[PDB]
Amino acid sequence: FGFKDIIRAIRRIAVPVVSTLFPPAAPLAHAIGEGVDYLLGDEAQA
Secondary structure, X not given: OOHHHHHHHHHXXXXXXXXXXXXXXXXXXXXXXXXXXXXXXXXXXX
């Protein structure tokens, strides 16, 4: 172990950097966080 362990730490410390530096790792979550609502109904629950 060692390198893969440091890489894991980097993968956990760069989580925010990756989401902000990688253009694909951000808007896609949007389609899953809001796209589902858009298809389910943006009227929330009432």
